[PDB]
Design a protein around this ligand. Structure first.
Ligand code: SF4
Ligand code: SF4
Ligand code: SF4
Ligand code: SF4
Ligand code: FES
Length: 574
């Protein structure tokens, strides 16, 4: 075995990890900053993980591997001053205004300021922040007075998407981060997925706020404000109210939304059953006569932008059904005004999403019908948590309430949408029933579920064999295509999500912090809430939702045709 004494404490091990990863497992904490996603900043490291090992001296723990004769120093003095110096040097390029900062109660730099008791030199107060700020994007915002240049957003974008859309740039003499040619992210190959925000330790990267759109709508006398939350929100916002991980808070969120002043409390899972209603019918129509194959999902805006910027020839193969957000939005300006006494231009639709790319989607020019936007505002999970906290709603102690039924009811098929393989499984439950005109008992497609990057399965429909694939994350779509895996058989239906794990690990989700992220498999525990909802729901197929059936029979007619085909669809030409 190898045998090391870190700070005079005895440890023998048959593990060949780094000093930082051995220490993380063994309670002895070493501080770190640029290390994340099994990588550090290769080009000018932050050196917060400095330790000293006798004989050699000061090394960076996040990438120095343990040796059998080591004696390592953490608390030390020469180590401790090398690190505190580094933090103070970052405060020289940091605007230290915690509160009103959106990262105040979970920062991880404020935490390294009070632990090492570091102070700037000259505190950094730019009189004009314009040059540092970029807010041209519909999904992402940058404030470089908070940027530590730790390279975490660049490495996270490369691992998670492989687009390398978040780059290190040379502006004048300085190094900044941003998009291709310091352009607005929307005008580049960027997917607006937000994984760079999730990797950022500070408030340098944030979602484009839609807080004032919601605010103004709630104070506006004539506006009827509709709110509907995504599948993933109920499996994750309780993390921000110190309730833990994998806690189902569906009922608390409906109550909280009533206390914020919303007029109707609906849900995007109703919209998810609507999308399956259209898309599963479209899949049956593509199986009747030979395609076009493959039909791809078109509900993830990060993926839609990936197939626009990188695979434009696939745009025709995408499902014409609108994403749950946008299909719900079209119906909230048409169906809901006809069952309530309202004029559609006084309805304002707000969604709560685990995603920043949803903001871009809602704001797309043609995502409207004669002046009325499908969706008027999209706030992330972190933004809903902010506005609950501002109102002082005692979230953890709220009584559970139910959604308003007409557009808030949902089946278990819609419920699993927030996990990778969720849309695939939900579409197959309805597509197999529609094509064979039966009510099938077996509905679990466990083989398309889970955290494997590329999952496939063979499905039998009408005693014929069909192949389906599930692409977990945008880096895996590039691997699927470039590998020629797409060509090893004829695929009939392919689900694609841009974020790894699915929407439960989207770019608008609660931050976690690495010394917690080490302990919890966050993609699995957030997803388990949703799968448990499906398993305990009596309706587990989209077409069985009672409020959905009332809407289609009384207002849209049959799926995939006539009126349903008119307004609940969107095709991308460009
Ligand atoms: S990013 Fe962190 S350290 Fe910087 S002002 Fe905000 S809360 Fe404070
Ligand atoms: S939003 Fe996604 S594709 Fe764009 S820079 Fe961030 S991680 Fe990269
Ligand atoms: S934007 Fe955030 S993650 Fe990216 S280099 Fe700056 S501080 Fe690091
Ligand atoms: S996987 Fe979900 S959270 Fe991620 S970009 Fe797509 S729609 Fe957004
Ligand atoms: S955490 Fe090790 S050099 Fe940055």
């Amino acid at each position: 075995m190898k045998t090391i004494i870190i700070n005079g404490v005895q440890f023998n091990t048959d593990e060949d990890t780094t000093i930082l990863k051995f220490a993380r497992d063994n309670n002895i904490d070493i501080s770190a900053l640029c290390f994340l996603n099994n990588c550090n900043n290769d080009i000018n490291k932050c050196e917060i993980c400095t330790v000293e090992v006798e004989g050699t001296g000061l090394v960076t723990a996040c990438d120095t591997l343990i040796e059998d004769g080591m004696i390592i120093n953490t608390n030390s003095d020469a180590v401790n001053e090398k690190i505190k110096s580094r933090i103070s040097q970052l405060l020289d390029i940091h605007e230290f205004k915690c509160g009103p900062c959106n990262r105040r109660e979970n920062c991880e730099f404020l935490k390294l300021v009070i632990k090492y008791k570091a102070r700037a030199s000259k505190p950094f107060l730019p009189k004009d922040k314009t040059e540092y700020v970029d807010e041209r994007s519909k999904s992402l915002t940058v404030d470089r007075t908070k940027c530590l240049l730790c390279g975490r957003c660049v490495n996270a974008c490369g691992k998670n998407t492989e687009t390398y859309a978040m780059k290190f740039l040379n502006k004048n003499g300085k190094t900044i981060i941003g998009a291709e040619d310091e352009k607005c992210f929307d005008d580049t190959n960027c997917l607006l997925c937000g994984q760079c925000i999730i990797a950022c330790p500070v408030a340098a990267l944030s979602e484009k706020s839609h807080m004032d759109r919601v605010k103004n709508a709630l104070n506006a006398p004539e506006k009827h404000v509709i709110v509907a939350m995504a599948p993933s929100v109920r499996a994750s916002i309780g993390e921000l109210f110190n309730m833990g991980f994998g806690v189902d808070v569906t009922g608390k969120i409906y109550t909280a939304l009533r206390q914020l002043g919303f007029d109707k409390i609906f849900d995007i899972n109703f919209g998810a059953d609507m999308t399956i209603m259209e898309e599963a019918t479209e899949l049956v129509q593509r199986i009747e006569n030979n395609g076009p194959f493959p039909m791809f999902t078109s509900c993830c805006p990060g993926w839609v932008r990936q197939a626009e910027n990188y695979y434009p020839e696939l745009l025709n193969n995408l499902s014409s059904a609108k994403s749950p957000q946008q299909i719900f939005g079209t119906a909230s300006k048409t169906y809901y005004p006809s069952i309530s006494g309202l004029d559609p231009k006084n309805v304002f639709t707000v969604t709560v999403m685990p995603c920043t790319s949803k903001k871009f989607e809602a704001d797309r020019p043609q995502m409207e019908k004669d002046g009325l936007r499908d969706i008027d505002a999209v706030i992330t999970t972190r933004e809903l948590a902010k506005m609950i906290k501002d109102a002082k709603i005692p979230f953890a102690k709220l009584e559970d309430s139910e959604a308003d039924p007409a557009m808030g009811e949902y089946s278990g098929a819609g419920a699993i949408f927030g996990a990778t393989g969720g849309v695939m499984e939900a579409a197959l439950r309805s597509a197999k029933d529609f094509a064979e005109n039966a009510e099938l008992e077996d509905i679990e497609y466990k083989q398309v579920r889970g955290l494997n990057g590329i999952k496939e399965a063979e499905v039998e429909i009408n005693n014929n064999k069909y192949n389906v694939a599930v692409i977990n994350g945008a880096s895996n779509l590039f691997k699927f295509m470039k590998s020629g895996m797409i060509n090893e058989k004829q695929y009939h239906f392919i689900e694609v999500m841009a974020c790894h794990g699915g929407c439960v690990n989207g770019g608008g989700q609660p931050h976690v912090n690495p010394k917690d992220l080490e302990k919890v498999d966050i993609k699995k525990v957030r997803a388990s809430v949703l799968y448990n909802q499906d398993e305990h729901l009596s309706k587990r197929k989209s077409h069985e939702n009672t409020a959905l059936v009332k809407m289609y029979q009384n207002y849209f007619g049959k799926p995939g045709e006539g009126r349903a085909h008119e307004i609940l669809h969107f095709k991308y030409k460009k």
